[PDB]
């Protein structure tokens, strides 16, 4: 699948892709952590 953007962008941005993937994985795990904490809080709230 071709892209119209210049390869001058692509060659450099290849490097930032790996770091962005690393950031995205950590952010996803982070958000899952808040989800778990918040659903535990919701369970407690429903009990009370």
UniProtKB/Swiss-Prot annotation:
It is found in: Nucleus; Chromosome. It comes from the Eukaryota. Belongs to the SMC family. RAD50 subfamily. The zinc-hook, which separates the large intramolecular coiled coil regions, contains 2 Cys residues that coordinate one molecule of zinc with the help of the 2 Cys residues of the zinc-hook of another RAD50 molecule, thereby forming a V-shaped homodimer. The two heads of the homodimer, which constitute the ATP-binding domain, interact with the MRE11 homodimer. Component of the MRN complex composed of two heterodimers RAD50 and MRE11 associated with a single NBS1. Component of the MRN complex, which plays a central role in double-strand break (DSB) repair, DNA recombination, maintenance of telomere integrity and meiosis. The MRN complex is involved in the repair of DNA double-strand breaks (DSBs) via homologous recombination (HR), an error-free mechanism which primarily occurs during S and G2 phases. The complex (1) mediates the end resection of damaged DNA, which generates proper single-stranded DNA, a key initial steps in HR, and is (2) required for the recruitment of other repair factors and efficient activation of ATM and ATR upon DNA damage. This is DNA repair protein RAD50. It comes from Chaetomium thermophilum (strain DSM 1495 / CBS 144.50 / IMI 039719) (Thermochaetoides thermophila). The gene is RAD50.
């Amino acid at each position: 699948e071709e892209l119209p953007d210049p390869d001058e962008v692509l060659r450099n941005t290849l490097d930032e892709y790996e770091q962005t993937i690393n950031r995205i994985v950590a952010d996803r795990d982070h958000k899952a952590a808040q989800f778990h904490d918040l659903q535990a809080e919701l369970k407690s709230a429903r009990d009370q």
